[PDB]
Write a protein that binds this ligand. Structure first.
Ligand SMILES: C[C@H](CCC(=O)NCCC[N+](C)(C)CCCS(=O)(=O)[O-])[C@H]1CC[C@H]2[C@@H]3[C@H](O)C[C@@H]4C[C@H](O)CC[C@]4(C)[C@H]3C[C@H](O)[C@]12C
Ligand SMILES: Nc1ncnc2c1ncn2[C@@H]1O[C@H](CSC[C@H](N)C(=O)O)[C@@H](O)[C@H]1O
Ligand code: SF4
Ligand SMILES: [C-]#N
Ligand SMILES: [C-]#N
Ligand SMILES: [Cl-]
Ligand SMILES: [Fe+2]
Length: 356
């Protein structure tokens, strides 16, 4: 037997970058990119994603104002503070009038997309949602729904009511892990919902959490390849943030740098997709969303849920700041975008096909 020495790390890292620049997206290339822990490799990866972002989606940072209108949920996901078994949380529901008028205010502040997100709350489904969507569509903006897993019939009604997009983060593409963490449902169910949403003509959003308990680098590679496979219009990625009132309270938090590399690789794989700098990135690191916008992201989603409900939508700890008024977030992200040298979106910021 003869030796089997490793190649030097710097030269290996440069070969990975070259393969990414040549769009040679093999599993081993993606795995090694995620595994390298070199500050200079990572910075070059971020700059490549930023370059691709500049070339294929430009300098507009699209603002999507989120109204989290109910924290009631019928599911029991192990990671989520809204899981039905968490009795330590005050639950709330907004009336349709509250939701519509709050959306109207965001539109007046300049949001060009309203995102309606909730727990899986049967109260609203399907007809209350349809009424709300129809009212918001009269305001001249795009509407995105993020309501979880529902029958095809509901998704069809909401499309007819005028919804433009649907965000259903796939969470994890590992079906064994998915079922362990989401004991009510399955990856197959989640994927079927995404396929139905695409067939109905929604712009569809997927995306995973990074750092889930039991998730490995190979699983993160599977997430990237799943996203590439379906050419998603939008991809929402962030770290897992443990919640103290859940079974995962004591697990490791997701790593910011690893999550940033997932955002960067997603931009490289899907050059003209819409990729938010998510709330969870801003929670985990001060300035986290600003950093993510320099590493391939092109969207920001200010929290527009009003007091006294905003503090109760406790997906994970630290999500909400209560130090400022509930109308500060849209002007605040506009200021952030200006300081980055970027521009707010001029239209609804729907995904375009300009890459290849
Ligand atoms: C706070 C400013 C000053 C140093 C800046 C970072 C560094 O510049 C390194 C790197 C350059 C990439 O290009 C974009 C990503 C990254 C992390 C920057 C992000 C952000 O801008 C930082 C955190
Ligand atoms: N602990 C957590 N850490 C980081 N992110 C978390 C966590 N808990 C939930 N989330 C994220 O919250 C998103 C919106 S819930 C909307 C709807 N009910 C749905 O399930 O699709 C989910 O897709 C998760 O990725
Ligand atoms: S992630 Fe969505 S479906 Fe799961 S418990 Fe939280 S709100 Fe409910
Ligand atoms: C996303 N809109
Ligand atoms: C989500 N931002
Ligand atoms: Cl988006
Ligand atoms: Fe989106």
């Amino acid at each position: 037997m003869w030796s089997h020495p490793q190649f030097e790390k710097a030269s290996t890292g440069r070969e990975i970058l070259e393969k990414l620049e040549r769009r040679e997206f093999t599993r081993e290339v993606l795995k090694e990119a995620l595994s390298i822990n070199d500050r200079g490799f990572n910075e070059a990866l971020f700059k490549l994603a930023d370059e691709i972002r500049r070339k294929y989606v430009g300098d507009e940072v699209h603002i999507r104002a989120i109204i989290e209108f109910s924290n009631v949920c019928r599911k029991n996901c192990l990671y989520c503070g809204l899981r039905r078994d968490n009795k330590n949380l005050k639950r709330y529901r907004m009336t349709p009038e509250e939701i519509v008028e709050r959306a109207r205010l965001a539109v007046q502040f300049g949001a060009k997309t309203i995102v309606l997100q909730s727990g899986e709350d049967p109260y609203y489904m399907p007809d209350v949602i349809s009424d709300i969507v129809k009212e918001i569509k009269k305001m001249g903006v795009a509407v995105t729904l993020s309501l979880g897993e529902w029958p095809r019939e509901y998704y069809e009604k909401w499309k007819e009511a005028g919804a433009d997009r649907y965000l259903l983060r796939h969470e994890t593409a590992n079906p064994v892990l998915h079922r362990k963490l989401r004991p009510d449902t399955s990856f197959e169910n989640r994927l079927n919902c995404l396929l139905t949403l695409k067939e109905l003509g929604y712009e569809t959003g997927a995306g995973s959490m990074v750092g889930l308990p039991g998730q490995t680098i190979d699983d993160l590679v599977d997430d990237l390849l799943f996203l590439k496979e379906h050419d998603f219009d939008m991809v929402g990625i962030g770290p897992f943030i443990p919640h103290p009132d859940t079974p995962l309270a004591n697990e490791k938090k997701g790593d910011f740098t690893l999550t940033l590399k997932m955002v960067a690789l997603t931009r490289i794989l899907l050059p003209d997709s819409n990729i938010p700098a998510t709330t969870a990135m801003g929670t985990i690191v001060p300035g986290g969303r600003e950093i993510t916008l320099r590493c391939g992201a092109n969207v920001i989603m200010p929290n527009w849920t009003p007091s006294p409900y905003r503090q109760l939508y406790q997906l994970y700890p630290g999500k909400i700041s209560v130090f400022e008024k509930d109308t500060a977030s849209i002007p605040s992200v506009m200021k952030m975008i200006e300081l980055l040298g970027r521009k707010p979106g001029r239209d609804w910021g729907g995904r375009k096909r300009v890459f290849e």
